[PDB]
Design a protein around this ligand. Structure first.
Ligand SMILES: [Mg+2]
Length: 271
């Protein structure tokens, strides 16, 4: 543990839609001789109910990245970026919030095992698209969402857990010590609030859509407000392979009193 005040600077957290975009593009933006982005979320592996089993399912693109971790993950980690596995529902009727005890342990074990096997830095939860109650699973919450966070924390206490603030996240207040950051789920305008009891220092109240990007000036002004109000993160959704440095440099100015440059590397998705 620390013995000093030990403030943490604002973290830039970006979600990559890996069905479309090579995640290496997150490394192409440099601020203060370090990567602009602090966390990259590989969006997303899925929770799937398959009979009584809770399963972790990696679609072909997610699985390709994991199978090619030395190519598509480790170069990011070498420059200090933390790479997280995104977790998302998949219309099976089973999600993070409606599992029984055995399913919770099964799913937590599957996730921890993947984090270990592929050398990841943790996970992000997006409780979206479970279609709760399809096909005989419970239609409502069982309390498993908080229990899953606890179980994962115990299995991987040194790894990161982030939560995209959508779905049954109102339940998570009591376990919020185990969650590093929560991320606002709507784009291009702040909401000066947090979810699930999180302090400002553990929340991103502003999430920029890097596909449908706002102006650099809009990002500069809002990110300056994020910083002034003491928030601990800024979210970014859907980084593509185009050069969006103008917007990130707006954030560098507003939140960091610095600049962001592009390294020239545009990585195609050749898989
Ligand atoms: Mg926003």
């Amino acid at each position: 543990e620390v013995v000093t005040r030990s403030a943490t600077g604002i973290k830039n957290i970006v979600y990559i839609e890996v069905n479309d975009i090579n995640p290496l593009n997150a490394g192409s933006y440099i601020m203060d001789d370090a990567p602009f982005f602090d966390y990259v979320i590989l969006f997303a592996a899925n929770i799937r109910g398959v009979g009584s089993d809770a399963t972790l399912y990696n679609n072909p693109n997610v699985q390709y990245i994991l199978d090619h971790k030395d190519t598509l993950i480790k170069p990011l980690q070498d420059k200090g970026i933390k790479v997280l596995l995104g977790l998302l529902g998949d219309h099976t009727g089973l999600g993070f919030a409606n599992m029984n005890s055995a399913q919770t342990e099964q799913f937590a074990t599957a996730v921890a095992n993947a984090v270990s096997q592929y050398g990841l830095d943790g996970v992000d939860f997006d409780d979206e698209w479970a279609e709760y109650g399809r096909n005989g699973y419970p239609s409502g919450s069982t309390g498993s969402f908080s229990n899953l966070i606890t179980a994962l924390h115990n299995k991987m206490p040194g790894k990161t857990i982030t939560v995209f603030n959508y779905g049954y996240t109102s339940e998570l207040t009591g376990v919020n010590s185990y969650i590093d950051y929560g991320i606002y789920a709507f784009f291009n305008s702040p909401s000066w609030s947090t979810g699930f009891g999180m302090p400002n220092s553990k929340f991103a109240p502003y999430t920029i859509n890097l596909n449908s990007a706002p102006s650099a000036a809009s990002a500069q002004l809002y990110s300056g407000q994020v910083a002034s109000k003491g928030y601990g993160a800024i979210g970014y959704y859907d980084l593509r392979a185009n050069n969006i440095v103008s917007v990130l440099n707006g954030v560098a100015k507003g939140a960091f009193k610095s600049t962001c440059t592009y390294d020239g590397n545009s990585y195609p998705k050749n898989y």
